[PDB]
Amino acid sequence: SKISEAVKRARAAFSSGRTRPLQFRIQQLEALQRLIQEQEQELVGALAADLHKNEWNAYYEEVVYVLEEIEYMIQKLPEWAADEPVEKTPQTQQDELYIHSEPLGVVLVIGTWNYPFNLTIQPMVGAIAAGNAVVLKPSELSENMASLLATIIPQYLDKDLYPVINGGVPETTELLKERFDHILYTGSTGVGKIIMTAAAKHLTPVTLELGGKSPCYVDKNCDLDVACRRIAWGKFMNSGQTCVAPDYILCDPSIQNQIVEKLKKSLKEFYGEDAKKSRDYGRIISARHFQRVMGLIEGQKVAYGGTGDAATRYIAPTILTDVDPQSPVMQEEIFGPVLPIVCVRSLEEAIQFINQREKPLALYMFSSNDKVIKKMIAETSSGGVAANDVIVHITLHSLPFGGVGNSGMGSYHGKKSFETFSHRRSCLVRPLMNDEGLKVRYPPSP
Amino acid sequence: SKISEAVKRARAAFSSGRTRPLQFRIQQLEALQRLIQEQEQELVGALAADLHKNEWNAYYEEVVYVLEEIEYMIQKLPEWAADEPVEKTPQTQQDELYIHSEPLGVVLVIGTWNYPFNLTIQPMVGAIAAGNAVVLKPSELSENMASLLATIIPQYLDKDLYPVINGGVPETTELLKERFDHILYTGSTGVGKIIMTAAAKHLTPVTLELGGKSPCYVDKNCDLDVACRRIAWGKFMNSGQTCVAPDYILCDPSIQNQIVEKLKKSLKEFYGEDAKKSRDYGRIISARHFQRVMGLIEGQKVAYGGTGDAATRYIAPTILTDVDPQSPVMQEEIFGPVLPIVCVRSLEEAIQFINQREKPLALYMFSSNDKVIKKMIAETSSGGVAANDVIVHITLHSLPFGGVGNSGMGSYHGKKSFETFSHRRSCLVRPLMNDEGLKVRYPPSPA
Numbered sequence: 001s002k003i004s005e006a007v008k009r010a011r012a013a014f015s016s017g018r019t020r021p022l023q024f025r026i027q028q029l030e031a032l033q034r035l036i037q038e039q040e041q042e043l044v045g046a047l048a049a050d051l052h053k054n055e056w057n058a059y060y061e062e063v064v065y066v067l068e069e070i071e072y073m074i075q076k077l078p079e080w081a082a083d084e085p086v087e088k089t090p091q092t093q094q095d096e097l098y099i100h101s102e103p104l105g106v107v108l109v110i111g112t113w114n115y116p117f118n119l120t121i122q123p124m125v126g127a128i129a130a131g132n133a134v135v136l137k138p139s140e141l142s143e144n145m146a147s148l149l150a151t152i153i154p155q156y157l158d159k160d161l162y163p164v165i166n167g168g169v170p171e172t173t174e175l176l177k178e179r180f181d182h183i184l185y186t187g188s189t190g191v192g193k194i195i196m197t198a199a200a201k202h203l204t205p206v207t208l209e210l211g212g213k214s215p216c217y218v219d220k221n222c223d224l225d226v227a228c229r230r231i232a233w234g235k236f237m238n239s240g241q242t243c244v245a246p247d248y249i250l251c252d253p254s255i256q257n258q259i260v261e262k263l264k265k266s267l268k269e270f271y272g273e274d275a276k277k278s279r280d281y282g283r284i285i286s287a288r289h290f291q292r293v294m295g296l297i298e299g300q301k302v303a304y305g306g307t308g309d310a311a312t313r314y315i316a317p318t319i320l321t322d323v324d325p326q327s328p329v330m331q332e333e334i335f336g337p338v339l340p341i342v343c344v345r346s347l348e349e350a351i352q353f354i355n356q357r358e359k360p361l362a363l364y365m366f367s368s369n370d371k372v373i374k375k376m377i378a379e380t381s382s383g384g385v386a387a388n389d390v391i392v393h394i395t396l397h398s399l400p401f402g403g404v405g406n407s408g409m410g411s412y413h414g415k416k417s418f419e420t421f422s423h424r425r426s427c428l429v430r431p432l433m434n435d436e437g438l439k440v441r442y443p444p445s446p
Numbered sequence: 447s448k449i450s451e452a453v454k455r456a457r458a459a460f461s462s463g464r465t466r467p468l469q470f471r472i473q474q475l476e477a478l479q480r481l482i483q484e485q486e487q488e489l490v491g492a493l494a495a496d497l498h499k500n501e502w503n504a505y506y507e508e509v510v511y512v513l514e515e516i517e518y519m520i521q522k523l524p525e526w527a528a529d530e531p532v533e534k535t536p537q538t539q540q541d542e543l544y545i546h547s548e549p550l551g552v553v554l555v556i557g558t559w560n561y562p563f564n565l566t567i568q569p570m571v572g573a574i575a576a577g578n579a580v581v582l583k584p585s586e587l588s589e590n591m592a593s594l595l596a597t598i599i600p601q602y603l604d605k606d607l608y609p610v611i612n613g614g615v616p617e618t619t620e621l622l623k624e625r626f627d628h629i630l631y632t633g634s635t636g637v638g639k640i641i642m643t644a645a646a647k648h649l650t651p652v653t654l655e656l657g658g659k660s661p662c663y664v665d666k667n668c669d670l671d672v673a674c675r676r677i678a679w680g681k682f683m684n685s686g687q688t689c690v691a692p693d694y695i696l697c698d699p700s701i702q703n704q705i706v707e708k709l710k711k712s713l714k715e716f717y718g719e720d721a722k723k724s725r726d727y728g729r730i731i732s733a734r735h736f737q738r739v740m741g742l743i744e745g746q747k748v749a750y751g752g753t754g755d756a757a758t759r760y761i762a763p764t765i766l767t768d769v770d771p772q773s774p775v776m777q778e779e780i781f782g783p784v785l786p787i788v789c790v791r792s793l794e795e796a797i798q799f800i801n802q803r804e805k806p807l808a809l810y811m812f813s814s815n816d817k818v819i820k821k822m823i824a825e826t827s828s829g830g831v832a833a834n835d836v837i838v839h840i841t842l843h844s845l846p847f848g849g850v851g852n853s854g855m856g857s858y859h860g861k862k863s864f865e866t867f868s869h870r871r872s873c874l875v876r877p878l879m880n881d882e883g884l885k886v887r888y889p890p891s892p893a
């Protein structure tokens with residue numbers, strides 16, 4: 001079959017030793033760099049057709065971070081790939097003790113649809129840098145990006161080492177029967193379990209980048225002008241279709257009306273009085289998801305927005321108030337421009353609220369008080385944390401990006417991507433000379 | 447069930463926050479130091495009854511490294527647990543960026559039988575230091591150690607946080623239905639797949655410490671006296687029942703006879719003429735494994751040993767020559783005192799041989815030529831590597847221990863244990879003051 005052959009050719013090319021020299025990897029990454037520069041309009045086009053992105057946010061909210069990752073990895077590769085000496089003991093002074101980094105082999109990257117370039121290519125960059133063959137499975141939901149990547153990747157990159165495989169569920173099930181040396185999966189908690197089950201059959205290590213509801217706690221005595229502007233930015237970009245979007249707000253009932261009004265002011269600033277007319281406002285990926293997000297608005301108190309167009313898959317920036325935690329909008333990942341506000345009367349109640357639910361990919365807190373920040377961090381568990389801003393904690397090379405519990409396992413970005421797509425091999429090199437100090441270990445015992 | 451209640455009590459005790467302060471963790475580790483000191487003779491008795499270990503090798507080939515691990519972690523815990531500052535970027539000048547370490551929750555440790563104290567308690571030490579509740583599932587095959595640990599662990603460690611669950615396959619199957627936040631499993635490649643399949647149902651991360659056949663390449667132009675003494679020591683300790691034992695030898699046919707003779711000399715030095723009489727020589731764990739290893743000797747050219755005793759599960763140190771790589775002794779992990787010699791005509795042939803097989807837990811090479819050492823490392827893959835020795839690489843705090851591919855995933859020992867049993871949480875703390883530099887990111891976008 002097409003899938004079986006593509007994978008075969010990928011392993012055969014890895015087995016030939018082609019990817020081992022650092023210069024080969026760098027040249028593949030520089031080819032990727034040229035692909036992004038030369039196919040920029042095509043990439044914008046794909047994102048515009050899939051998610052209603054424009055040339056600005058297609059670049060500065062997705063593409064640029066791939067480029068920054070490529071530049072960073074090219075520069076750092078010599079340092080990362082070097083044998084790393086580790087601390088010796090008095091008994092191992094004459095020995096070499098070091099960590100040897102080596103490729104895993106054939107890596108499978110399964111992408112998702114909300115950032116269909118970044119979440120296919122940024123994992124790929126790390127895997128290429130680590131010296132792996134990389135099989136790409138882009139999301140079928142983002143049809144235009146999926147089609148484009150299958151076309152343009154083989155034009156710039158090694159055709160055998162880095163194949164693109166497109167398809168739906170059966171094709172993915174078929175792909176998952178193939179033997180890989182690592183699988184990075186970005187997607188749902190439910191399918192994540194299926195991915196790990198398939199990986200178990202070949203003892204394939206997994207990086208699962210999954211979902212959940214990222215809580216956003218707003219402290220009663222903080223600058224709400226700054227806070228709500230930052231929150232509205234993170235929540236409503238890509239029409240709320242961000243894994244690290246502030247899913248819901250936790251706040252004192254005394255500031256709920258103030259929060260509504262400031263989110264309001266920020267949303268008008270960003271997208272005008274009518275967001276349907278903003279070139280900067282996105283659309284829902286599919287009809288299936290449009291219906292889902294609209295269904296979560298039913299039976300709720302709509303403080304802002306609430307209306308949607310099925311033909312264009314537009315959903316107005318919606319703010320819900322006094323939301324019952326047991327209602328549908330607070331029982332699933334929204335992944336849409338619907339921001340529910342849930343009232344809690346203390347920091348302690350907020351911590352308990354977060355702790356009683358599944359561990360989120362991101363946790364957000366807005367507070368002028370640092371003890372509040374540190375207390376919430378120490379008493380909760382989440383993939384990552386950002387205090388007094390949203391989203392940005394995943395844009396920094398020095399901060400590994402990943403989940404915990406239901407939000408996932410493993411992590412990547414920057415050096416972590418190199419590590420994750422490598423095997424770190426402990427090495428002890430000794431002289432083959434008679435050492436009297438070793439005599440104690442040999443039988444007979446004293 | 448008793449299994450469900452024990453896991454429930456462990457989660458409840460963790461959810462209380464009891465393990466969070468470092469003093470509490472240190473106190474549990476000190477209790478393990480106390481356990482080892484006060485139960486030394488009982489630990490020896492268990493290992494003697496299970497594996498025919500003696501008071502010396504029970505301590506110096508197992509127990510002492512748990513103690514060293516405990517001493518090391520107690521000292522380093524403040525350093526490890528502290529928030530880790532990371533490198534800033536030009537825009538993140540006024541921000542705090544760090545990595546915050548936190549426990550995962552309830553960790554399950556499934557131990558194996560060959561080093562039944564070390565491979566239950568060393569992983570536990572790491573999981574304790576990282577602030578987890580820890581459920582211990584000792585191997586049923588090492589019966590005496592399993593029983594002892596069920597008795598002595600609650601006598602020293604917190605009873606709710608650190609329960610011991612004994613049982614066979616049915617009990618483990620039920621235990622694997624419980625929800626854990628991490629599982630460290632030490633055992634076979636096949637059962638590793640079963641554990642990972644179970645873990646998938648709860649999205650539980652796994653550290654799998656598995657098996658394979660660790661190759662030992664012996665170069666032509668090296669000191670064979672020194673080499674074979676080191677090899678024989680690694681291969682024949684614990685009656686060959688070591689995951690990182692040099693499973694088989696790859697060498698040029700021109701040095702095969704010399705290797706045989708020098709292995710024989712070393713074995714005579716170690717255990718005498720008749721190893722059955724040596725206090726330092728172990729026994730096979732079970733009747734099933736006795737028959738299995740004896741089966742692997744059949745049809746082979748025996749150059750030394752080759753005999754056994756079913757009643758005592760004794761198998762004489764055995765060397766096999768001119769071994770067909772396709773024969774039974776070369777198609778499975780031996781895990782016994784049978785050392786096959788397989789002939790290769792070059793380093794290149796040896797590299798190809800290793801690469802055709804599944805990735806081993808350890809890879810060994812003996813050579814005076816650094817280029818041979820570096821080429822074999824660069825062109826092969828294995829969990830860990832030692833050049834000009836065996837076993838030792840697993841005893842060092844600064845070298846993480848674990849497999850790759852069929853030999854496993856993840857790693858532990860030293861700092862790596864703390865990291866493996868923690869969630870490393872990326873944290874960005876910004877000031878809540880107006881920043882003009884951030885305004886560029888907000889809509890509306892420029893034309």
Ligand SMILES: NC(=O)c1ccc[n+]([C@@H]2O[C@H](COP(=O)([O-])OP(=O)(O)OC[C@H]3O[C@@H](n4cnc5c(N)ncnc54)[C@H](O)[C@@H]3O)[C@@H](O)[C@H]2O)c1
Nearest residue numbers: 112113140168169172186187188191194209210211212243
């Ligand atoms: N952590 C991250 O980095 C990150 C990034 C983006 C999105 N996400 C998460 O992804 C989720 C949304 O993305 P999504 O792609 O799951 O959307 P979705 O669930 O709408 O997409 C359905 C996808 O699942 C696949 N699928 C369905 N059944 C399958 C089976 N039996 N086997 C294999 N594949 C199967 C389909 O092929 C399809 O691609 C959100 O929960 C979000 O939090 C996480």
Ligand SMILES: NC(=O)c1ccc[n+]([C@@H]2O[C@H](COP(=O)([O-])OP(=O)(O)OC[C@H]3O[C@@H](n4cnc5c(N)ncnc54)[C@H](O)[C@@H]3O)[C@@H](O)[C@H]2O)c1
Nearest residue numbers: 558559586614615618632633634637640655656657658689
């Ligand atoms: N990497 C390491 O740290 C390390 C250390 C020691 C041993 N090992 C490996 O362990 C292997 C031998 O140890 P072993 O414990 O597998 O002994 P073994 O092969 O005798 O296996 C018996 C064990 O498997 C379990 N088992 C069997 N079927 C099962 C099922 N369906 N579900 C759950 N459990 C099941 C049994 O309960 C029993 O405990 C060797 O391959 C060795 O390399 C690895």
Ligand SMILES: Cc1nc2ccccc2n1S(=O)(=O)c1ccc(F)cc1
Nearest residue numbers: 061062065066115118243391394395
């Ligand atoms: C760098 C990065 N890591 C991500 C992880 C998940 C989703 C998008 C991600 N991105 S991203 O697409 O580049 C990105 C998305 C939004 C944003 F505001 C800034 C960056």
Ligand SMILES: Cc1nc2ccccc2n1S(=O)(=O)c1ccc(F)cc1
Nearest residue numbers: 507508509511561564689837840841
């Ligand atoms: C420290 C250590 N790491 C291990 C990993 C696997 C099996 C035994 C292990 N040990 S051990 O039992 O202490 C050990 C075993 C044999 C030996 F020679 C020295 C130490």
Ligand SMILES: [K+]
Nearest residue numbers: 301322323324
């Ligand atoms: K309501």
Ligand SMILES: [K+]
Nearest residue numbers: 439442443444
């Ligand atoms: K001695």
Ligand SMILES: [K+]
Nearest residue numbers: 525526528530
């Ligand atoms: K630290």
Ligand SMILES: [K+]
Nearest residue numbers: 885886888889
């Ligand atoms: K602006």
